[PDB]
């Protein structure tokens, strides 16, 4: 169906599984020779770079949260508050 960016309802925060998976995903990619969007302060470990890319919210990813009924909500790493 799709849900408007407005009328949105889920948690303003990032679920640990999201964080976990995004760092995982992003790491996989960085490790795949994907482009890196931060100054590697010399870092050389992907999941470490992913950790940085995530701290500067410079991760081009988007989380599609599905609902029991099928419709979802789209959120970007940018938006999502990263407490934890």
């Amino acid at each position: 169906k799709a849900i408007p960016k407005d009328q949105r309802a889920t948690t303003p925060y990032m679920t640990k599984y999201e964080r976990a998976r995004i760092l995982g995903t992003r790491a996989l990619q960085i490790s795949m020779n994907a482009p890196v969007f931060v100054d590697l302060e010399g870092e050389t470990d992907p999941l470490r770079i992913a950790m940085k890319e995530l701290a500067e919210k410079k991760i081009p990813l988007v989380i599609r949260r599905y609902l029991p009924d099928g419709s979802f909500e789209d959120w970007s790493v940018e938006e999502l508050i990263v407490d934890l």
């Binding site: 609902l67 029991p68 009924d69 419709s71």
Partner: protein, 107 residues
């Protein structure tokens, strides 16, 4: 509503669902000596308008099935005299958060 004492004839009983829309219900004396709802354990239930219900669904994005059900013959279901389709809101106490609201549809 008809209150029999010891019992009604099975010849009799087969005459209640024969004059709709109207409806009839049979209750035993010994079953009403005490109101069950007054029990420590039975939380209060409540009938939902064909509207309040259509709302609930639309408010949780629920299909009718996915809703926790209540027996058509369930003690309390007769105390309120539900109907196959009517939904009940059950507000009870909770040692986790004062009050918890649960719903029960009827089968």
């Amino acid at each position: 509503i008809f209150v029999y004492q010891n019992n009604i004839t099975p010849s009799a009983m087969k005459l209640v669902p024969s004059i709709p829309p109207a409806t009839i219900e049979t209750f035993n004396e010994a079953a009403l000596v005490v109101n069950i709802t007054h029990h420590e354990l039975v939380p209060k239930h409540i009938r939902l308008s064909s509207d309040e219900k259509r709302e609930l669904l639309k408010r949780y994005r629920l299909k009718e099935s996915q809703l926790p059900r209540i027996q058509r013959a369930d003690p309390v279901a007769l105390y309120l005299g539900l109907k196959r389709g009517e939904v009940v809101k059950i507000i009870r106490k909770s040692e986790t958060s004062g009050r918890y609201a649960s719903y029960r549809i009827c089968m």
